[PDB]
Design a protein around this ligand. Structure first.
Ligand code: SAH
Ligand code: SAH
Ligand code: EMO
Ligand code: EMO
Lengths: 474, 473, 37
């Protein structure tokens, strides 16, 4: 391997993307100042970038990716990608021991020895974990082994839904990822799209869809290594839970998942509350199929007071919504029966017929195509002529563009490249855990036409996750 | 959690940072063009960037990192870091199945035929390669049709480099997965012992892993010998061949020997030029813990007056003689320029009074107790005119170090993102062998416990630097 | 005779000399005004 000369075109696009970066900077600081102006006077300010600010961040992220591709030494860049999982571990370790919350308790910083005492991590090792993150823009170093929050880690202070999402990505998903190569090449696992034969079942060594394994009650002495190749939630070694009335303990992963989709829904699903004309429906009923604890009803309820909701998911998830999540984030909505909960399996006929909107967010991507058309057929059988089914999922674009999605300017990747890195990370999480699939428009059309539904519109929003609006072919 | 207004300082530094990127681009294209003229006339061009180009890549990467920190939505950015490991895996998967080598064998290749020659199913393999393409590795040229791009091309006919990816994506990954649990367990957590690390928790063993790789196992037991470690993924379809004694060597042994060639040529190439080796005359360097001797290979091409002895464990010295040096420099074995020694660097150095004892990526594999013994056995054999050069990351921080040069403000003094590889490896050493990558002051104390003084730190065209050591005499 | 693609060096020098032309214009204007006085 020798180093190659760079071409004319490399230089020209490196200039072109540098000028794009420079224009995006002028847009971003302009819209920071309009944002500031919206904050003082007081809405959507507190949840969403403006359209102008979001387009500049997305553009400027895409340009960032292509500049790195063009200026890096190729072998250096190959080995930086190869090892970048260790930064994931660092963030996971830090968030799992609530270091954002500990640093916010002072903020002139905290000596790492005193940080060490409150985390359980050894101080000189914990120094290297935090300086990893500091070099990469998460946390700050303010003195010799003295650390503090920065503008990025601050969003983790008193943010249990967001910490739950970090914990979900670093726990089951990590070991599932570790076994995903061996799953892909084995001639029996390699081709199946079955929910029961993923890298994840291989990691846990069980034969059950992962949805019910997280719902088990385990005996206290069996729980820490109950995960087999999956090590389990790291904090359980230091914070054991006392057995409940049955002498069993819950798996931490159940409530982590419930809150993680609240957390994740507020980062990437916030756009759908404002870039869809919900107010134009008046006093309508939204049925949140697979609604989880109801995180998306939470976001919509605060803004459109005339909508009525019913949240449909598995029994145990519903009960967490009713006993801890909604009491503590919107008790008036339940006491007025504005939001109702319903234990339901979306492989069956939906009990609610003729509702205005059926919302289905981050459910279709958890299953391969056969299950998916069953779940959509379940709803369809229950829709009125004026009913609307809204699928909230990544509608995947490619580096070379799609007829039905807007492309980035040339010379950028048509899908804005780095801007979509999260969508691709979740694509592999879905393969490792549930055999699910993040889907292109053409792949969504094929399962919607198999379910007797028609796609009326794609909604591009201030998110890399979008809305697919479908009615029945009638 | 609500969104916060950005401050004046965010804007002022976002401008200062953007202007730095813009100056770097003008320097980078200027030095690409000096590179083009030098590639044409024809040395060092083919192995490593110019000084001015290297400072421009390092500065612009530092500025890139700070720009992401200033413009991102904090939560978006937190969840992007949290899940970015799947890109490590995707690359691992693609590189494991020699997808670079396959696409260079052809306008692009259909993914269905890519599936045939990899064993990965075509619908799924599209999604691994469009992940990589979205992030600038490989290119998509058509409807699910793929080809090498400027970044992935460097893996074609590059077994030393491919081995390094495979090493970071195999054992190191499972050690990393169990590294949170190991850090908090009250027994393993405080330990710096080479045998009580996340790696041992993964393998279900007590032996240092330098010897676990060297075990001889029988085929029916081998693929799940790693316990929680899945093993090299290719074994499912490419069984290992039994040797003449009926046992198979474990794949990780051949991988690791070649990996340190690959790794040594990426971040250790600088040291071949930004230290005055020619000035030593005809010198003998002893490559202690030299592995296969990949760095003797890098130096042998350039300074024909130097002579070498490579010190390591039997099987790698063995693999060096039977598959590596035959095919990388058979002339060096006929001229006795290189002699080999199966040796444990925990014993007195067998070669006394050599010009250079080269020790690269050996100290970062051990906590402080082990390092002071290896450093003393080297020096127990040094003459007063002898020189010990250790090639390791000399770790700086985001607030600078007195003995290392800082980046311009507002950039992190250690160039931030430019050092992402050193930190990834810092956690690998913590995860697998309880090693440590060290600051200048942490290097100084372990050298004075071995009776050595730090003579100079050599800043080079690499994050990895050189420490030159004397005898305390 | 066919047209040939331009090289990286052609682009980089066309930029560098344009930037030289532009610096020279500012000097010339400054010294026209000193000369006139
Ligand atoms: N068989 C089934 N019937 C109903 N809901 C199910 C189900 N299997 C899984 N689910 C639910 O499907 C959801 C997938 S995650 C999506 C959660 C929610 N839509 C949000 O975006 O916040 C989980 O909440 C899980 O509880
Ligand atoms: N006790 C011991 N005696 C000798 N060599 C050892 C050893 N324990 C580990 N090693 C060797 O130390 C090396 C660490 S990796 C460094 C390889 C080489 N310096 C390079 O940079 O390419 C491995 O090759 C391993 O085989
Ligand atoms: C191990 C694992 C299993 C899952 O079912 C999910 C995930 C991980 C997961 O990370 C996830 C993220 C998300 O944003 C939406 C989801 O529906 C999910 C998931 O559904
Ligand atoms: C599982 C594992 C064990 C190791 O001992 C190393 C590594 C991985 C490793 O990745 C590594 C990289 C490197 O650049 C230098 C090393 O000495 C190394 C290693 O020594």
């Amino acid at each position: 391997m020798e180093r190659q000369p760079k071409s004319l075109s490399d230089a020209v696009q490196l200039l072109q993307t540098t000028e794009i970066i420079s224009k995006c900077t002028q847009t971003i600081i302009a819209e920071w100042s309009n944002e500031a102006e919206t904050f003082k006077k007081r809405g959507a300010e507190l949840v969403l970038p403006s359209h102008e600010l979001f387009n500049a961040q997305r553009t400027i992220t895409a340009a960032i990716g292509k500049l790195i591709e063009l200026v890096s030494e190729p072998s250096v860049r190959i080995l930086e990608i190869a090892g970048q999982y260790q930064e994931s571990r660092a963030l996971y370790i830090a968030v799992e021991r609530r270091i954002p919350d500990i640093l916010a308790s002072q903020e002139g910083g905290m000596p790492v020895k005193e940080l060490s005492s409150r985390t359980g991590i050894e101080h000189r090792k914990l120094s290297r974990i935090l300086r990893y993150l500091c070099s990469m823009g998460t946390f700050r170093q303010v003195g010799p082994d003295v650390f503090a929050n920065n503008t990025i880690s601050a969003c983790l202070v008193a943010n249990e839904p967001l910490r739950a999402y970090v914990r979900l990505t670093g726990s089951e998903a990590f070991t599932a990822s570790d076994r995903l190569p061996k799953t892909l090449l084995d001639p029996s696992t390699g081709p199946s799209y079955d929910v029961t034969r993923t890298a994840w079942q291989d990691a846990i060594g069980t034969t059950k869809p992962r949805w019910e394994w997280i719902e088990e009650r385990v005996e206290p002495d069996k729980l820490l290594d109950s995960g087999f190749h999956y090590p389990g939630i790291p904090s359980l070694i230091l914070e054991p839970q006392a057995p409940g009335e049955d002498g069993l303990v819950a798996r931490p992963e159940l409530e982590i998942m419930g809150l993680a989709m609240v957390g994740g829904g507020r980062v990437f699903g916030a756009a759908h509350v404002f870039d869809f004309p919900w107010a134009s429906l008046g006093n309508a009923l939204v049925v949140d199929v697979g609604g989880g604890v109801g995180g998306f009803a939470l976001q919509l309820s605060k803004v459109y007071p005339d909508l009525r909701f019913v949240i449909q998911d598995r029994g145990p998830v519903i009960q967490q919504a009713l006993e801890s999540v909604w009491p503590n984030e919107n008790p008036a909505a339940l006491k007025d029966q504005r939001v109702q909960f319903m234990e339901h399996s979306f492989f069956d006929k939906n009990p609610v017929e003729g509702a205005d909107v059926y919302y289905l967010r981050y459910v279709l991507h958890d299953w391969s195509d056969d299950y998916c058309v069953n779940i959509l057929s379940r709803i369809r059988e229950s829709m009125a002529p004026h009913s609307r089914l809204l699928i909230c999922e990544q509608v995947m674009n490619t580096t070379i563009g799609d007829p039905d999605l807007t492309s980035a300017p040339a010379p950028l990747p048509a899908n804005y490249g780095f801007h979509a890195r999260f969508s691709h990370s979740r694509d592999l999480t879905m393969m490792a855990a549930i055999n699910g699939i993040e889907r292109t428009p053409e792949e969504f059309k094929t399962i919607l036409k198999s379910a007797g539904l028609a796609l009326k519109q794609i909604w591009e929003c201030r998110s890399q996750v979008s809305l697919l609006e479908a009615v029945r072919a009638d």
